[PDB]
């Protein structure tokens, strides 16, 4: 029941921002994240 | 990016001839190597287009109530009514570059290339999809400032974002507040001068057009080289195979194989060297997206001339246009 | 520290679990290996000579026959080296560009801290650690990322005794009942004071300015010092 | 509040005189006039 599907790609999740002339969001907390990046030399 | 080109080395050197194909196998991997080289170029066009525009894995959207403190982004935000959702300034950009084959099916220089085993492959991302990624970048910029770069998008009022910017160039945030009508008017008026420039002069997009013109000029040159004799009794392969038996035809066809194969090595070398120019430019545009759009840069003259405030990306035929906003 | 220690753990587990991550370095090693094999396989091609084996020409033909066949192999072979060296020069330009970028990230992410957004990993750059790899470099970029946000009401400036006030650093916010001042990248609210803020102009010009009392940390330090003094005068009724 | 101190007037090339205002000053000296009239009044009973 598996098969090759073909589709027009989505570019990401749709996300309207909570914008308003007097609204702000501020982070109460944070994460330290470590990301590997690799370059040929 | 530049137009993806696929050439079939065998269809170009040996148009429908078994004899020429059997002689071409005497060279071995030369035909495959030149398709590997052009495939490495064709694939890194989609990479370059991803590096520049696909900087956010989420499609931000502007609110319906445009209360951006008096700043009027309506000429750089999407248009709902136009069949492709590009902005007003993006439509001017799409009119002001001319293309030699877009690759979108056939049913003239485009025709002459296709009749000779030369093909243009379509980009992965459509011009609607680059308009959507540009909408996400611009709507994140207007509604969230740098914060959508550093993590989740945080809303901030647009005049309050511009205040953080001003502190960023060492001008105190009340210099915005006390002048906000003037600063919004100057911005609105400068977005006006972008149109009154691009609408009227031909040369402004010249960097993009020159990139298209070279890929066109080189495909035209590779089409023309099929008319070279290279010392054979004809430039046309069938006229040799018609007038000679195998024992004399092989001597003539071997000249044309040698000359056409040297012509492809020239095209593929010119295209690989050119492809390095475009990759350096894509890395520059991805860096300018990261540092001028998703942020504010303290790097002098990196994000347009003057003290950088913010910048807005726009889609363009095979390119990007940055509208840099600077305090002078 | 615990988040950092755990994230370094997730690097170990990532590089254990996934196949594709080194796919840049692996693709560079494959490209030069495949090119060298292409260069050796191109020796077996005839180029129209009666064999690709050099001695099968030199024996089975006379001198002025053989020279016409050997010159095909010399021509084709020389073109094979010119092709490999052209592919290697063009390749070397990409590795150079990548080495100059790596030397720039060593300079700016390892020897420093970058204010260039998304240059040294995604998020706000804290620091980076280099690791050696076959023909390459790996950076572990460490970044601060904003996590749990709350919405707040905000204002451009605050009004008190008819003058406007603005934050020295940070932004004003309200939880719905009280105004606070806080740093723009982490929620730590404070009572709004004359030490957190500076003054400019009367209350009319600022679009969106609200009304909220500002505290003066010199004031109750003088006003309690009026009651002490006030107590003196009461004592001084008695002697 | 706008300025910070370091060293004395001899070392800096091209330094100039001007007065430097202190905002604590009339905020204390008004609190001396607020005091002086109270001492004068408290002679009267
Ligand atoms: C907005 O933030 C304000 C500051 O945290 C908060 O006001 C504070 O509310 C608490 C009660 O939840 C008060 O705490 C005191 O309450 C009585 C006072 O007699 C005592 O029994 C307690 O032990 C304690 O001392 C704070 O006094 C009060 N602070 C102020 C400045 O009024 C608001 O409740 C927050 N508003 C919203 C909508 O969340
Ligand atoms: C923030 O606080 C301000 C000070 O209380 C307040 O200003 C005051 O606003 C009222 C209403 O507009 C004015 O009332 C007077 O209006 C005219 C004179 O201008 C008279 O005809 C009326 O009879 C009445 O006396 C106050 O004069 C005015 N105060 C000052 C110093 O101008 C703001 O309106 C407050 N804003 C908010 C959003 O609360
Ligand atoms: C800036 O203002 C300064 C304060 O008024 C002023 O400094 C004063 O300069 C005079 C003249 O040089 C000195 O006069 C005394 O000098 C020595 C003792 O140090 C004696 O031999 C003299 O007879 C005389 O008493 C003042 O002592 C000196 N005051 C201080 C506090 O250093 C500057 O001259 C002014 N400069 C300018 C350019 O405006
Ligand atoms: C920040 O608030 C927005 C919406 O504004 C609020 O709307 C009221 C219900 C009330 O909460 C007011 O204080 C605000 O003015 C949030 O956006 C909504 O998110 C939910 C999903 O969580 C979604 O179903 C709604 O459709 C969204 N509405 C809009 C207009 O976008 C936003 O999620 C809040 N931020 C956080 C961190 O929760
Ligand atoms: C900030 O977020 C971190 C997680 O990213 C929270 O830390 C966790 O807290 C829960 C309890 O609430 C514990 O069970 C976990 O073990 C904690 N993890 C770590 C790494 O310590 C933290 O509580 C949050 N801080 C605030 C102030 O909300
Ligand atoms: C933002 O600028 C645009 C362009 O000037 C404004 O759009 C015009 O609005 C007037 C008045 O309704 C119309 O007569 C024009 O025909 C509109 N032109 C276009 C291109 O739509 C827009 O109104 C401005 N926004 C604000 C908030 O003032
Ligand atoms: C594929 O080819 C067919 C023709 O063989 C095209 O079909 C024609 O389309 C036009 C325009 O819509 C119609 O006027 C004709 O009547 C169609 N002819 C037939 C025989 O159906 C079709 O448009 C082509 N599709 C693409 C994407 O090129
Ligand atoms: C700062 O310069 C701006 C122009 O960029 C001045 O604004 C203009 O002022 C004149 C009157 O002096 C008006 O006729 C124009 O319409 C204004 N232009 C705009 C875009 O609003 C402004 O007056 C100057 N400000 C100061 C304090 O000198
Ligand atoms: C903010 O927008 C609301 C409508 O949503 C409006 O009532 C209010 O006057 C606006 N305030 C400012 C400062 O723009
Ligand atoms: C009142 O002042 C006198 C000194 O004049 C001092 O001895 C006494 O302790 C003071 N008492 C009080 C209650 O202040
Ligand atoms: C500036 O230099 C000149 C000499 O070139 C000198 O006469 C003058 O007093 C100096 N002024 C200041 C403020 O240093
Ligand atoms: C003088 O002192 C008395 C208290 O003894 C007080 O009632 C009165 O208001 C004061 N008058 C003035 C003018 O200070």
Author numbering:
A (entry chain B): 689 to 729
B (entry chain C): 730 to 836, 848 to 1068
C (entry chain B): 924 to 1162
D (entry chain C): 1118 to 1162
Text from the published report:
SARS-CoV-2 is an enveloped, positive-stranded RNA virus that enters a host cell by fusing its lipid bilayer with the target cell membrane.
The Delta variant (also known as lineage B.1.617.2) was first detected in India and was quickly characterized as a VOC and has since outcompeted other variants to become a globally dominant strain within several months. SDS-PAGE analysis showed that the Delta trimer peak primarily contained the cleaved S1-S2 complex with a cleavage level very similar to that of the G614 and Beta S proteins, indicating that P681R has little effect on the furin cleavage. 3D classification gave three distinct classes each for both the Delta and Kappa trimers, representing one closed prefusion conformation and two one-RBD-up conformations, respectively. There are no major structural rearrangements in the Delta RBD with two mutations, L452R and T478K. Neither binding nor neutralization of the Delta variant by most anti-RBD antibodies tested here have changed, suggesting that the two residues are also not in any major neutralizing epitopes.
